[PDB]
Design an enzyme around this catalytic site. Structure first.
Site, PDB file in Angstrom:
ATOM      1  N   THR A  28     -10.977 -12.360  -8.163  1.00 52.66           N
ATOM      2  CA  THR A  28      -9.832 -11.228  -8.450  1.00 52.66           C
ATOM      3  C   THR A  28     -10.107 -10.288  -7.426  1.00 52.66           C
ATOM      4  O   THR A  28     -11.175 -10.119  -6.866  1.00 52.66           O
ATOM      5  CB  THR A  28     -10.100 -10.466  -9.742  1.00 52.66           C
ATOM      6  OG1 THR A  28      -8.841 -10.027 -10.049  1.00 52.66           O
ATOM      7  CG2 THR A  28     -11.410  -9.882  -9.830  1.00 52.66           C
ATOM      8  N   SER A  62     -12.054 -17.372   1.864  1.00 49.38           N
ATOM      9  CA  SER A  62     -10.893 -17.809   2.539  1.00 49.38           C
ATOM     10  C   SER A  62     -11.741 -18.609   3.915  1.00 49.38           C
ATOM     11  O   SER A  62     -10.841 -18.868   4.705  1.00 49.38           O
ATOM     12  CB  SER A  62      -9.873 -16.855   2.809  1.00 49.38           C
ATOM     13  OG  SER A  62     -10.229 -15.896   3.814  1.00 49.38           O
ATOM     14  N   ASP A  74     -10.310 -13.186   5.535  1.00 53.68           N
ATOM     15  CA  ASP A  74     -10.677 -13.762   6.650  1.00 53.68           C
ATOM     16  C   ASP A  74      -9.558 -14.905   7.370  1.00 53.68           C
ATOM     17  O   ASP A  74      -9.735 -14.864   8.561  1.00 53.68           O
ATOM     18  CB  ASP A  74     -11.964 -14.552   6.287  1.00 53.68           C
ATOM     19  CG  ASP A  74     -13.258 -13.512   6.273  1.00 53.68           C
ATOM     20  OD1 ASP A  74     -13.303 -12.406   6.294  1.00 53.68           O
ATOM     21  OD2 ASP A  74     -14.261 -14.374   6.027  1.00 53.68           O
TER      22      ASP A  74
END
Lengths: 326, 314, 326, 314
Positions: D16, D46, D78
């Site tokens: 989240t 990511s 990222d």
């Protein structure tokens, strides 16, 4: 051996920047008391005490608040390890430079504000205040002049400026860059300002009740000379020109400020252009007209220095030297 | 088929940047891309740019549109961003108008003026340049006349569109355009200066700590048609300045709140009750830009709601 | 008393940046001789002598040119008052940092290039070279480390980087800003780099014939581990990761570099992100894996430091300390 | 009339930022602007983003377009710039798709994730957001998926469209759009991934002084379908890397020259004879961006002239 945290004093000048993971406290009539309760993590890094000096929007910042602040820090220096000043963002950059030129206290003074209301989603004030305290508490922060801490970044009071109307990242030292970045409560300092500051200036406001009258006029196509004439007619001690380009003046503004300088009004050429110096030895013959070139000082920053210069001298050659050293 | 070059007209407002009929000599590579004809409109440092030169230029482009395929305006850098936006709003000619200057003298080492002129003429000659409004070409970049501004006192790369970015970059005499201004310009404006010999009087006042109200009061006492505030932060006003401008806005003086802050909008719905006071928020127009649109708005209306909608669309 | 100008030596590594107000000279086989003839205004500020060290495009810059340059400056230090190095822009930022870490000579070393060909309209090289000479000649330029002068700006060799593929203003010190601006042949210095440089480093290349093998691998979505595996299989002394975000690694690149570090390959986490530090104490447990965080050093700059670190030690804790001091 | 809020679908790819059905709780001001439904597509950092998640997402938006008025994709910062451009080229749904993340943890002081999500949903809900391609909303700014990139390792203001600027700024839950991407996107591309379960293998190699050819050779030996060079300056290559990639480009490996330099185009007609070698210039696509368009170009053609035209239009 007991670990002992530094004592940091928070001088408040306005509204709170931290408030509405919310800590549960009873809101009192003193804004700075509410602020410290809003950021309970301050206890992990410092013994914090807060004094409310004034309570204004920084758009209504003024010479009296400046003198009150410099005198309080200079008088209270031995009672604390460092100072954080909570301030509106609109004029923080002016306050910071005034304090950079008048604080004689050899402990860190760190100014901090918030670009979003304390009540808004993702309020920036709580973490900015926490980082200003980190900065004020770091022994490596001393001897760097008066500082501004915004958006995880330590900025010198001379070059810092507000670059954007709304962005939380708005504060940048646009000519010479930041002093250090803050990550996980630690600062990697790679720069210090070379211009003289704090205990190395001649400015001593301890006994001053007011500051010399210095006004600002703006240049643009078909510029009116009515503002410059108004400041001259009032007997202003100095005028700062927000010039076009490299500190150039519309001819009718030129003519009014040349006549003023001849009567002994101090005239400093700055620029409306947001980065870069107003240089000596450009298209204006400063020496002929009795004008001062501001360097990288923007118009509002040039006013702060010129007011203080005018407590020392009204000699434009001496004022230029001050504009080349501080 | 014989290859034909476009006809480009250089209008000069100052000294040479590379006189005005000479420039085919000074930058002979121009002969490879255009048939250039030069005219001297005025010859001033742009720090002395004024309403009279603006009207002369808009009228000259509008009248001479049929005669040529494109215009390049050579101009001083100091007020180029003001003239560009003035022409952006008042040009009705549907052919490119490109402004250009130089940050180093023509006689200086590594003078920028030659290549800048060359790229300005590339831009004025490119059919892809049409319908993008009045342009500024500086340092290999095509910049819209609304957002372009001088960001540095001395840097050759000073001109930047600081809020919304450039329209394209120029490499090897070609442009890769990837943007065009959404705000209405040129022949999509109501502003028609063909018959005006003067413009409404609009002054600019600066805000800072302990700001004097004497500037604002000097403009109000002169009966200025409008005042632009270079506010602090999000268009805020020092109290004494706020008092004088609140008085002006209900006594026949239009008041636009802009900001001394170099990027970002002065927004509606912030700390100032614009509706109570009859004020207009400038958005991303900086004080000198807002002055241009206020002067043109005041040719059409004195109504603050109507001025605010102009500030919302142009 | 005779006015005497400083002696400045121009070491050339490539093509000329000044050439085609054209001065009239006979073009010779030595590029640096042609350069000095192209910029006759150099005589107003310095007694210039030029040596052509190599003649390459800087995209083919290499360890041998680096060692040849450091050794020549260190050997020739007493014969001149300052050095200007003419270089291609593509790798100037790497050369500058290598020289910042290995020059022991206490006189200014200033690197300079040109973003436009010497033959092009509005060539930048002539005025850049003139400003590099100004910089090299200024007594205030000493003790600031190895410098880059481009676009009227004095930049420190550590933070300077090429930010734009074509812009004449491409060179910026993107984290900590420039040291000073140059106007009319004069420099207003307001900053100096705090990280140790030149005579304050342990790096001594005087006797080295080669430098440790350090390679760079790039991170991105679905990144291949084949490059990292190739460098490991070759017995590379070190690998620099151009990580995503705060120095993060795609898992297959992570796994290869963790295994390498365990065998004694030095591994430095940097970032493909063009500004900001790869910090210690983020999502990677450096101490566990034997990895080094690069700080504000970009991947190419981290390689320069890691090669030199590896002449001193292969201990990752010692390499981290070097990455926190230089 | 009863006022109706738009239906917005959040697709989560990680933790989240303010779980995914919870977010109506965490940022209750979302209830004032949208009817939000949440789905967890995957849950990864990511830095481990991959081709499989890209295909899952494009397919999910394309299939579910009718079901909703707009999508918000929560994603790690990222590799957000890669996923945005991948979706920009492969989404056919004519409703806004807005990516959002956070530079500070949800649990941190002054976490940016709440307001970022709020503004992402404002963007996905604005009819003015349609037809602008896939977007990234970060720090009060709407950014096009092609130009947006992470410019700083830690700064909340890290995401910038560094070549052409933002499309609009968000203030008080409103957007003033002044730009839209010219390059073709979404349903104006040929790229159709509805039937693909894998994408062409495309690797990135870095250039610097004394660069090893071992990376390039490891990709060539693996039979990669393409290699993107993060070149020096204007897409230049260290000699040993140039030698290996010249060999690859005529042996079945597409080679795109990009640049490690953070802004500006890798241009045609510079120091590299692209035609001789069969190379493609990336223009303003940075290496990871060029990788996305090369992988999609290779689904359609292996011809370098054809790939170069795709790089010229998308």
């Amino acid at each position: 051996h007991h670990h002992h945290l530094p004592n940091i004093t928070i001088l408040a000048t306005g509204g709170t920047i931290a408030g509405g993971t919310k800590s549960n406290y009873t809101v009192g009539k003193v804004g700075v008391e509410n602020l410290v309760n809003a950021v309970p993590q301050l206890k992990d890094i410092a013994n914090v005490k807060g004094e409310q000096v004034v309570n204004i929007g920084s758009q209504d910042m003024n010479d009296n608040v400046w003198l009150t602040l410099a005198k309080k820090i200079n008088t209270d220096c031995d009672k604390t390890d460092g100072f954080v000043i909570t301030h509106g963002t609109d004029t923080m950059e002016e306050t910071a430079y005034f304090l950079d030129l008048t604080v004689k206290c050899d402990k860190p003074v760190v100014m901090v504000g918030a670009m979003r209301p304390s009540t808004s989603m993702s309020a920036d004030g709580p973490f900015n205040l926490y980082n200003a305290v980190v900065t004020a508490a770091d022994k490596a922060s001393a001897n760097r002049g008066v500082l501004v801490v915004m958006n995880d970044t330590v900025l010198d009071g001379r070059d810092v400026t507000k670059t954007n109307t709304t962005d939380v990242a708005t504060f940048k030292s646009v000519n010479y860059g930041p002093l250090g970045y803050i990550h996980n409560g630690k600062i990697d300092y790679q720069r210090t300002p070379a211009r003289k500051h704090t205990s190395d200036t001649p400015f001593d406001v301890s006994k001053l009740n007011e500051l010399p009258k210095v006004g600002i006029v703006y240049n643009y196509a078909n510029a009116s000379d009515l503002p410059a004439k108004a400041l001259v007619d009032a007997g202003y001690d100095g005028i700062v020109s927000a010039g076009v380009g490299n500190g150039n003046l519309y001819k009718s503004v030129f003519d009014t400020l040349a006549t003023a300088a001849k009567t002994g009004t101090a005239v400093v050429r700055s620029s409306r252009v947001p980065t870069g110096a107003t240089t000596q030895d450009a298209e204006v013959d400063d020496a002929k007209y009795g004008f001062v070139a501001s360097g990288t000082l923007n118009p509002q920053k040039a006013r702060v220095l010129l007011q203080l210069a005018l407590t020392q001298t009204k000699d434009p050659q001496q004022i230029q030297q001050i504009f080349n050293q501080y």
